[PDB]
Amino acid sequence: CPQIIGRSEWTDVDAKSINYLIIPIPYVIIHHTVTAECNTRSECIAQAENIRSYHMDSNGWDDIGYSFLIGGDGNVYEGRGWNREGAHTIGYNKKSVGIGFIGNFQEKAASDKMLNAAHALIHCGKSKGILREDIRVIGAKQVTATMSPGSKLQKQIKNWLEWVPTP
């Protein structure tokens, strides 16, 4: 397991109550945030806080929409976390965790430290029993009308055995 940065470590604004997922979980959805990349803990904290602010104040959501974020610092940031319904993937918010890579990966690749953090998080989740042993990893674009997680990151996740060509 990676050492996850808890939600209260990056924001002081409380989430509203969110309904609970059934565990173990069958899907992981890979997203990109479309924000700028971040390369240090201070930078990635700021990005997480500003996505949360936009989601809660502008979209009116109960919390940042993602389950977790991956920073270019190589760290995992807890959003809604392992146990709560998402606001990341319409049709899958009750049966997945949604992992947002911080950046725009349409034209550029995600760094090795980001991919390793995300894959270690998926392995951790399986090991602990939070994710099903037969977890299906998919890019958002495979199940919703979106360019997320970006064409380049979409290619990169195909290197994981857990990735499936259909949901």
Side-chain angles (χ1 to χ4, degrees):
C1 294
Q3 292 177 308
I4 299 164
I5 299 171
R7 191 183 179 285
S8 66
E9 307 186 51
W10 61 260
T11 185
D12 297 346
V13 178
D14 292 337
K16 311 283 179 173
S17 192
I18 298 165
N19 289 165
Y20 297 172
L21 294 172
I22 297 275
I23 266 64
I25 299 156
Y27 294 94
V28 171
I29 318 296
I30 306 298
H31 280 271
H32 69 172
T33 62
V34 192
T35 65
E37 296 180 52
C38 60
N39 289 283
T40 66
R41 193 165 169 123
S42 188
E43 243 161 61
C44 293
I45 287 169
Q47 276 289 359
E49 162 57 23
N50 283 277
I51 297 164
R52 181 215 58 75
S53 179
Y54 184 73
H55 287 185
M56 293 181 70
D57 292 358
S58 285
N59 300 334
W61 295 348
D62 298 318
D63 197 2
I64 195 169
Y66 302 103
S67 308
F68 297 94
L69 306 173
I70 311 294
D73 63 352
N75 288 313
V76 179
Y77 293 77
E78 183 195 35
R80 292 175 183 227
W82 289 122
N83 287 276
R84 287 167 173 89
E85 287 181 6
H88 49 80
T89 314
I90 292 175
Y92 287 76
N93 286 316
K94 304 193 222 299
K95 57 176 176 189
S96 74
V97 287
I99 298 175
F101 281 62
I102 298 168
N104 189 331
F105 304 105
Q106 181 56 28
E107 298 261 55
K108 52 196 79 187
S111 66
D112 292 333
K113 70 204 322 194
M114 299 181 84
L115 283 160
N116 198 274
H119 202 36
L121 184 65
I122 292 162
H123 281 207
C124 169
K126 287 197 265 161
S127 281
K128 278 176 169 286
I130 301 161
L131 299 178
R132 287 183 63 104
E133 301 276 306
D134 59 1
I135 189 74
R136 291 166 189 178
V137 173
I138 56 170
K141 62 186 296 170
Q142 293 180 245
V143 294
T144 55
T146 186
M147 290 300 277
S148 183
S151 293
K152 194 81 179 164
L153 179 50
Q154 180 73 16
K155 289 182 176 70
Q156 293 173 285
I157 67 175
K158 300 181 180 187
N159 296 321
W160 295 339
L161 291 182
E162 302 91 343
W163 179 75
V164 297
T166 56

